[PDB]
Structure formats: C-alpha cells, structure tokens
Amino acid sequence: TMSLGAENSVAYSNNSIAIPTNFTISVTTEILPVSMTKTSVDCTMYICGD
Amino acid sequence: STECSNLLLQYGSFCTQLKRALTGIAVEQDKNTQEVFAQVKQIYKTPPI
Amino acid sequence: DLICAQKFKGLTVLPPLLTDEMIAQYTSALLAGTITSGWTFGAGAALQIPFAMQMAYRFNGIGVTQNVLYENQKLIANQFNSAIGKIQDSLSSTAS
Amino acid sequence: FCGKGYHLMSFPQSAPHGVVFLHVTYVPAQEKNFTTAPAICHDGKAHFPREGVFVSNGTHWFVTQRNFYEPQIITTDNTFVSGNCDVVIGIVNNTVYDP
Ligand SMILES: *[C@@H]1O[C@H](CO)[C@@H](O[C@@H]2O[C@H](CO)[C@@H](O[C@@H]3O[C@H](CO)[C@@H](O)[C@H](O)[C@@H]3O)[C@H](O)[C@H]2NC(C)=O)[C@H](O)[C@H]1NC(C)=O
Ligand SMILES: *[C@@H]1O[C@H](CO)[C@@H](O[C@@H]2O[C@H](CO)[C@@H](O[C@@H]3O[C@H](CO)[C@@H](O)[C@H](O)[C@@H]3O)[C@H](O)[C@H]2NC(C)=O)[C@H](O)[C@H]1NC(C)=O
Numbered sequence A: 001t002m003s004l005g006a007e008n009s010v011a012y013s014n015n016s017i018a019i020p021t022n023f024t025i026s027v028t029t030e031i032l033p034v035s036m037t038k039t040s041v042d043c044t045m046y047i048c049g050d
Numbered sequence B: 001s002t003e004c005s006n007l008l009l010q011y012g013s014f015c016t017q018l019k020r021a022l023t024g025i026a027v028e029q030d031k032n033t034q035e036v037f038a039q040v041k042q043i044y045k046t047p048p049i
Numbered sequence C: 001d002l003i004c005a006q007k008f009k010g011l012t013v014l015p016p017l018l019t020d021e022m023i024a025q026y027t028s029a030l031l032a033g034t035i036t037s038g039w040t041f042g043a044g045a046a047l048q049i050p051f052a053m054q055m056a057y058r059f060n061g062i063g064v065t066q067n068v069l070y071e072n073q074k075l076i077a078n079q080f081n082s083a084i085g086k087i088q089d090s091l092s093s094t095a096s
Numbered sequence D: 001f002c003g004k005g006y007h008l009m010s011f012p013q014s015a016p017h018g019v020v021f022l023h024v025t026y027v028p029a030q031e032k033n034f035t036t037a038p039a040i041c042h043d044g045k046a047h048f049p050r051e052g053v054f055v056s057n058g059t060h061w062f063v064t065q066r067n068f069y070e071p072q073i074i075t076t077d078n079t080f081v082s083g084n085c086d087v088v089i090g091i092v093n094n095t096v097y098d099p
C-alpha cells in the first residue's frame, strides 16, 4: 500500500516562533512544449495511387 | 459469434487506437488528482489543544 | 441493476488510484499546515507562529495596521465563527 | 509559479519543439526557537513593531526582521504607539530606549 509521506507534527504554542538564521540558493528546471510537426496530406496519391 | 471475429479481422486495426485513447484518458484522470492534491511532502498533525 | 446492464456489454469502470481516505489525509495535512504555520510551510520548512500574530500580518498585507486586529480580536473571532456556522445551514438546505 | 520558494530570476534555454526555464529561488534554513509577544507596554502605552517581530533569547527583548535573525534594540523609531496597555491580549512589560 502506497505511503502518502512522512508523518510530522508542529510544536504550536501560545507564545513561540521559529526564525531562520541561514539560507540556501536553489536552481530548478522546467520543460514546456511549444510547437509540433507540420504535416501535409495529398488526397489524390493517398486514396487513388496511380 | 465466432464468425464475426473472423470478419472483423478484415478491417485492420480498429481496436488498438480506441484502447490506447481510453488508457491515456484514464492516466490523465489520475494525473489530474495527483497534481491538484499531492502538494505537500509531509503529513502534519494538529495539536491536541 | 444498472451497472450490470452496461457491464454485460463490455463496458467496465476502473477504480481511481487514490482512495477517499488518502484525499482526506491530504486535506487534513494542508489544513493543519495552514493553521500552525501560515505560508512558511509552502516554501520550505514549517515554522510555527501564534494564530493572532499571523492574522495581524495578514491584515498588514492588505493595508490595514495590526493594532486594528489587536483591538478587535474578539469581534473578528465572533464574526468568523458566525460566518462559518452559516455555511453549514447554507449547505444542508435542499437548494444544492 | 516561477519555481518553488521565493522567486528571484529566471533564465531561458531552447529545446527541440519546446523551451526550458531555470528558476533561481531563495530557501530559508537553520531555524531556531524564540519567545514572542504581540506588543510591549512602557509607560501606559502600547508599542507595536513597524516591520519586524518581537523575540526574546530568555532574558532580553529584541526586534528583528521576519525572514532572517538579526536582533536589534527596541527604540522609538522601530515602534509606533497606538492605545493603552489594557486592550491587547498578551502584552509584556519592558522598556523602550530613547535615542
Ligand atoms: C550557512 O550555511 C553555509 C553553507 O550553505 C555555511 O557555510 C559553510 O560553513 C562551513 C563551516 O564554516 C564550511 O565547512 C568548512 O569549509 C572549509 C572550506 O575550506 C573546509 O576546509 C572545512 O573543512 C569545512 O568543511 C562550508 O564549506 C561552508 N559552505 C560554503 C558553501 O561555503 C555558513 O557557515 C552558514 N552560516 C552560519 C551563520 O551558520
Ligand atoms: C541574551 O542576549 C543578551 C544580549 O545582551 C545577552 O546579554 C549579554 O551576554 C553577553 C555574554 O555573557 C555579555 O557579555 C559579557 O559581558 C561581561 C561584562 O562586560 C564580560 O565580562 C564577559 O566576558 C562577556 O563579554 C553581555 O554583557 C550581555 N549584555 C547585557 C546587556 O547583559 C544574554 O547573555 C543572552 N542570554 C542568553 C541565555 O543567551
């Protein structure tokens, strides 16, 4: 049976906060199609060849 | 109808593309739900209070 | 005697990959993250923050200072509770 | 929309019958635990931060930006006064420096 992810719990409280002290620079890619192949069909030769 | 199975074989491949299209539709249907809902890699829990 | 009528003519239905329980778990996880973190959980590690402070920052993000919330917290909570309660009455009505 | 995280900039690259984007993002890391308060009362007046949060390391109180730990002394130019000290739930007694 597939697992949805790792279990986690957030330590919520009346007066508590978390402030980061460092950073990381991340580079990710993304691919998107734009166009496809242009095609042409000749009826006379395809349907009635010679 | 055992004869009809032989007669339909004379029409080429009129069943492969239909099956492929339906399978693609089903795969896209699964991908839609995966895209919409599976957005978090962690399962958080609300506090008891 | 409706699904069988179509099934006996080679028309089947395949079950979805994700069950209802998994979708419910996803929604519950999203709600818990939103409540206990705000928007930090959507950009990396989740950082906890009190709800009132998060609401103050959300007000500050639309051009209203946070002292307004810190002075009208009770009224805002009452209004939100009434608005949420009205949604149940709206949905439970026959007018779907 | 443009990558995951806080977007900074993007670079385009060409692909056969398509296009590829390189997204540069900002990701925080190495968080720490702190105690926070919504407001600070000095002389019967409530002081709210301008563009920061109130944090404490256990003994003292500081004000810092919300996305990077950089504590600073609470000063009248960092806070603005609005109201008194009996309308805020969770106010904390402290002192505000006069520069
Ligand atoms: C914030 O995170 C960065 C990493 O993303 C920290 O920089 C890293 O600091 C450590 C220890 O100072 C470096 O390890 C040492 O590197 C030297 C390089 O010659 C090596 O000789 C040592 O044996 C040791 O491995 C690490 O290289 C460095 N990373 C980078 C990319 O420079 C930074 O210290 C963190 N900031 C704070 C305030 O913690
Ligand atoms: C929370 O942050 C405050 C920031 O002021 C810390 O207070 C400061 O703590 C440092 C470290 O002990 C003190 O420096 C020491 O000063 C004495 C006397 O000048 C010197 O003999 C030591 O060698 C050391 O340099 C600093 O004076 C002190 N500042 C004040 C205004 O009290 C506090 O320690 C932090 N608390 C925790 C739990 O991290």
Ligand SMILES: *[C@@H]1O[C@H](CO)[C@@H](O[C@@H]2O[C@H](CO)[C@@H](O[C@@H]3O[C@H](CO)[C@@H](O)[C@H](O)[C@@H]3O)[C@H](O)[C@H]2NC(C)=O)[C@H](O)[C@H]1NC(C)=O
Pocket (backbone or CB within 6 Å): D091, D092, D093
């Ligand atoms: C922040 O500081 C203020 C004052 O600077 C604190 O106010 C305190 O409020 C209590 C209310 O119960 C005062 O207690 C008093 O005790 C006498 C004893 O006879 C009683 O007759 C009064 O009716 C009253 O109950 C207390 O005196 C007062 N502090 C001072 C210095 O006058 C406040 O509690 C501090 N903390 C917060 C979170 O505001």
Ligand SMILES: *[C@@H]1O[C@H](CO)[C@@H](O[C@@H]2O[C@H](CO)[C@@H](O)[C@H](O)[C@H]2NC(C)=O)[C@H](O)[C@H]1NC(C)=O
Pocket (backbone or CB within 6 Å): A009, A010, A011, A018, D031, D032, D033
């Ligand atoms: C801030 O403090 C909380 C509570 O003191 C930390 O949450 C605990 O983390 C430990 C990790 O070893 C768990 O074993 C505990 O069960 C957690 N407690 C609760 C109530 O959730 C939290 O990790 C601290 N923040 C950081 C950045 O360490």
Ligand SMILES: *[C@@H]1O[C@H](CO)[C@@H](O[C@@H]2O[C@H](CO)[C@@H](O)[C@H](O)[C@H]2NC(C)=O)[C@H](O)[C@H]1NC(C)=O
Pocket (backbone or CB within 6 Å): A014, B049
């Ligand atoms: C602090 O947190 C608690 C729960 O996380 C808040 O709720 C209080 O919980 C205690 C514990 O039984 C009750 O005695 C109080 O009556 C609860 N408060 C209310 C208003 O119902 C609590 O409000 C938070 N703040 C303070 C100052 O305690």
